Design a protein around this ligand. Structure first.
Ligand SMILES: NC(=O)c1ccc[n+]([C@@H]2O[C@H](COP(=O)([O-])OP(=O)(O)OC[C@H]3O[C@@H](n4cnc5c(N)ncnc54)[C@H](OP(=O)(O)O)[C@@H]3O)[C@@H](O)[C@H]2O)c1
Ligand SMILES: NC(=O)c1ccc[n+]([C@@H]2O[C@H](COP(=O)([O-])OP(=O)(O)OC[C@H]3O[C@@H](n4cnc5c(N)ncnc54)[C@H](OP(=O)(O)O)[C@@H]3O)[C@@H](O)[C@H]2O)c1
Lengths: 311, 311
């Protein structure tokens, strides 16, 4: 059997589908990993990763028979693509098939923060409705929605938001032709012109902390940050502090700079919503993603064109 | 000054705007109400109500100089329209200007229930992310959305849902022409053909408990009820029981049969979201609603056509 190393427990269904076609190895269940590696290097010809654990230089080097990294994710920042090319390794990912769900999440977060849906449900559950009305909140429809990275997921968000009458603005390195959204040439100018700012760009050293104190200052005390990209896209300590002090209106967060660690100071804030990276986390979508990873592995090991190759 | 009786504390801004133009009376702050009534009947020429307290037969009769009931709401089920006509009383309401916000709430509820946004945020806040992943949830995009009452708010919901690729179905007493949504001639058939069922019709004796056990049975264990209409539209005890037992997939509720009382058995359910009637509860919308009530009062007392008359 071909040895396939799965980096972490990302999908029981994927475990099943991999185990019936290959020799599935469960990296996360080995106490002494380096030795394990050394011990099964001769067998491991594929790596299956995701947004928590991919294939870095050091792993790739310990896996000298590695032929392909098939990521259970669209994001690729956990995979060393350069190293991959130097050692002959293909790389595939899962684009588009999760688009719908991550953009639905971004809209869910907007509403949950502006309409305090989470705070309302808690208010009710502790019997506080008996003593009075919940406070007034903020209207979503018609608000200015700015999107950083008008890509597959950014476009999907934009089109949902349009149906709520939101004026759409965006920053990308380049303007998407034939779109009537407002292009801005800098994240800071975008944030000044947005009630709501959505992060939908990939993570690279060039977009690391693209949400900084300046941007946060530009967004302001009435402004709301939606992060469905990657944790390190934001200078988390400056995000936490602007929220604690009231210098940023609020935030809906699916990803954190050091997940699953979430700064506990956020835990007492009522102008934030915090989710454990669930953008793609539905039965329907994880299924298709899993079949896609399988598909790429089965294409690779049978000499066919890969399905969603990146490298 | 013209005596205006405000039934309950619905809007500080409205209190302000009323108090600067009329003699504002605060019904809710009188211990012995019947006597109060008797005592200020000669002065009270207007009633301002809302969805919690309107103007019933008995109140109208105790207010023999009553000329107009201006409701701080679109719903009119708290106003006795027949009695109003017999005693010469105008009635106005606030249609359209809250449409956006109540339909945004319905979408917010759908997402918050299908994507367990509220359960996710709680999971995070109690440190559970450190021990593992939140469970998989349900995709909203593409699901069958059924709407009971394709009116101002029902249409607004339908058009939002379309942008998530949802097939739209509806039941109204009559089919809206030129719409390509699927008309069904009965709520039960609608529920059988819906993943998500939204209540957006007015409350009358004819729609009371329109959501019954049969409908609930039709919706089923994977089906999700969204109630943004009125509490008594549902047979609450049968709703509670289907949720406790798992016979209904889940529910997002803005209104309850006996608000603000909410059946505490709901408090332990993770497949429900509970909000204290906040459909219209934003600074932006309550402002416009308040100016509308004022507008109708100022039109009435100055012999002009009313703005949003119903009676
Ligand atoms: N929450 C979650 O579960 C979750 C799930 C999936 C994905 N994600 C994140 O979402 C990202 C986006 O996915 P996608 O599928 O939509 O990919 P995508 O189609 O590649 O879109 C990415 C976009 O970002 C823009 N971009 C790239 N580099 C940029 C830069 N330096 N500055 C500004 N904009 C830049 C691109 O525009 P230009 O080329 O013009 O600049 C493009 O619009 C992933 O990489 C991942 O990190 C999160
Ligand atoms: N959550 C909250 O804060 C909140 C806020 C505002 C309003 N509401 C509720 O929302 C309701 C709807 O408001 P709206 O502004 O959208 O009013 P609307 O425009 O009158 O729309 C009502 C709709 O319900 C349908 N309908 C009326 N009677 C019906 C019946 N017996 N059976 C089935 N359908 C019936 C109508 O269609 P047909 O005539 O063809 O049957 C119409 O589509 C209000 O009356 C109120 O109770 C709740």
């Amino acid at each position: 059997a071909i040895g396939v190393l799965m980096m972490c427990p990302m999908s029981t269904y994927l475990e099943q589908e991999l185990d019936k076609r290959f020799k599935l190895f469960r990296y996360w269940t080995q106490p002494a990993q380096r030795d394990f590696l050394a011990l099964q290097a001769e067998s491991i010809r594929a790596v299956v990763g995701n947004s928590n654990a991919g294939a870095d230089a050091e792993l790739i080097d310990a896996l000298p028979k590695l032929e392909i990294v098939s990521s259970f994710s669209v994001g690729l920042d956990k995979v060393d693509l350069i190293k991959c090319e130097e050692k002959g390794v293909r790389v595939t990912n899962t684009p588009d098939v999760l688009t719908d769900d991550v953009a639905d999440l971004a809209i869910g977060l907007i509403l949950a923060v502006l309409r305090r849906i989470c705070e309302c449900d808690k208010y009710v559950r502790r019997g506080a409705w008996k003593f009075g009305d919940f406070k007034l909140t903020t209207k979503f429809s018609g608000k200015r929605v700015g999107i950083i990275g008008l890509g597959r997921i950014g476009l999907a968000v934009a089109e949902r938001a349009e149906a709520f009458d939101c004026p759409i603005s965006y920053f990308s390195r380049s303007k998407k032709p034939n779109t009537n959204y407002t292009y801005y040439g800098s994240v800071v100018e975008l944030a000044s012109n947005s009630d709501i700012l959505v992060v939908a760009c990939p993570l690279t050293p060039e977009t690391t902390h693209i949400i900084n104190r300046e941007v946060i200052d530009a967004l302001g005390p009435k402004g709301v940050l939606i992060n469905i990209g990657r944790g390190p896209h934001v200078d988390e300590p400056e995000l936490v502090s602007a929220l604690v002090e009231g210098r940023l209106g609020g935030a809906g967060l699916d990803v954190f700079e050091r997940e699953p660690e979430v700064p506990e100071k956020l835990f007492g804030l009522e102008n934030v919503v915090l989710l454990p990276h669930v953008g793609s986390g539905t039965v329907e979508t994880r299924k298709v993603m899993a079949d896609l990873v399988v598909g790429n592995l089965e294409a690779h090991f049978s000499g066919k064109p890969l399905l969603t190759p990146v490298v």
